[PDB]
Symmetry: D2
Subunit: 194 residues, 4 copies
């Protein structure tokens, strides 16, 4: 259920794994055995980030190992997003819009999944500003218009024109950027990070 119940269970598991009783762990943390027992009873909700770091350190592990997974936001395995629900960020430079990021469905059961419908408002490939590469892989599909894609080394990019209906895979960590094809107005693509 909660961060605190998750932590209570996982803390007890780890403490037992390294064969410490409450007193042994407490002696490493500037607490009483009673307080450690309280954490395992679900009373750790007010522990700070700093405190959690020290707990993980003395237990030879990470805060992540002591906290629950993201959770389950699915309806028997599925989640649906209607179009009007989409979060929207505008990619703006000096009060001029270059991209509109229309956010599609996401889920705590697969946190790396970030699908977007991207409206590409610049058709000047000079405006392409390289990112530093994504943490995960990405699948792209051109919905409207024509895309001018650049990738690799921002000072020596590989480039390609993608017509409507083209699809593309970009591996994790590969820097890239795109605009609409020179003079062609606007384009639209779906980008699925995963």
């Amino acid at each position: 259920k909660t961060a605190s119940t998750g932590f209570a269970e996982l803390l007890k598991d780890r403490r037992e794994q390294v064969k410490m009783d409450h007193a042994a762990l407490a002696s490493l943390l500037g607490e009483t055995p009673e307080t450690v027992a309280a954490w395992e009873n679900g009373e750790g909700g007010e522990l700070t980030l700093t405190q959690l770091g020290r707990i993980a350190h003395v237990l030879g592990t990470s805060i992540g190992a002591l906290t629950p997974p993201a959770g389950n936001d699915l309806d028997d395995g599925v989640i649906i997003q209607m179009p009007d629900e989409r979060p929207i960020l505008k990619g703006v430079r000096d009060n001029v819009d270059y991209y509109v990021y229309n956010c599609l469905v996401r889920t705590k059961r697969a946190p790396s999944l970030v699908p977007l419908v991207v409206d590409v408002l610049t058709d000047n490939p000079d405006d392409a500003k390289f990112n530093s590469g994504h943490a995960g892989n990405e699948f792209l599909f051109v919905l409207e218009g024509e895309i001018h894609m650049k990738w690799g080394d921002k000072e020596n990019p590989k480039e390609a024109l993608l017509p409507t209906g083209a699809s593309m895979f970009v591996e994790e960590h590969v820097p890239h950027a795109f605009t609409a094809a020179k003079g062609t107005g606007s384009a639209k693509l779906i980008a699925v990070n995963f």
Copy 2:
């Protein structure tokens, strides 16, 4: 480079890991030490599936541990597919088409990625035929028309109508099926397995 060079390297690595010399391994396989040495020199290309199974067995591991990864088909991190390249399978029952699967870009660097543009030709939800669930997660986005989605238990499904622009996530192993909404003709969606 090759299956055989990959195998030669990986076989040597595993043999060394379990501290066997050529003679020790050969004595387990009905071969000479010379033949084992030949495999590690790249001469294993004619080994059969059955033979590879026995080699993996005596080395306490899998055929996969002894064979190279899928390979690299990327162009500095990227691969692009033009629309006319798409492989196409028709979902047919008794010479009547129900689905057209239009295959988008794939890569050996992420073999589970299988993106499709799916043309949905049936608009009778009675025609929905449940699969048994996918091995991986799936992201769907309705491109045209309206989809009638069913999921979960084929004898008691959860159901939802997805308008154009709706998006959906279906977790691995969840059985599902879809048609166009009753009487609405045809629909189209993009489905990205990953």
Copy 3:
């Protein structure tokens, strides 16, 4: 500083991954954009477990995804423990008054590794108490004496008498128990959870 600095970096990365600016995230949390900026400037150390849970929730991920890995406690890839250094622990749960845990080297670079010299002071197999299995796999080696091992179904167990020098592998989740062989007084095992 490690926890707050790592959180600052990972928070920024995730917020950017899901196309939120400071104001967007701030709104979802009921905070100001300046508060979010401060967290990304390393000022998140006093955030509570419960608060971290809410930040993870709105970002559709886990606290683990927003906090750094365990850290590095190795000396150019190695850590050593001298025999005088071992934590000597009485044990936890069922295995306390008749088992002494001499804790061997551990590292945050492999948190699941928990090696122990277990002094086994009970020689009554009849009184052996089953656990409910370990979270990970276990390798064991009989250092001294003779071990009476039991595993599987506590009501109808598999058993083995293991002389000095015997070795064993126990898969994750398999319930088991050990005493010294009947009447032999005591024995010692090295137990390596990994």
Copy 4:
């Protein structure tokens, strides 16, 4: 039968995953659809490594993805080895005439686990030969005698004298070497690669 039967199942699954019918795959391979059907009916056992490579290639995946995991050699989750059963191996590469490898229990359920009793017959640290590091992590325990360990840069190494009962962790890829301490004749270690 395991290899051919597992291949039959995995081939079918993958072919279906990428929306190919028998004829589609057959064409890509230059075979008939009946040949592909026969493979999916368990008749692939005489397929060569090179042929398996071509099938994997056209299916955009690895041979590993098309072949079964190592298999199960456990007795209700456990495997045991008596001391009389150990393979005694002379060693490989640099570590042969002055090291005896007494191979401890292994399992296909954890193929990376390679535990050894290493009899260390050299007591000249000066002659210690570095490896280039192991593929996985290693835990060690000094069973007998006194070990002189070296690691890191062979030209300017870190070193430790490790009495009986000392324990050590060596991360993957870290070069290292051991002899007995100068003039002490011999020593024994348990080395657990995992």
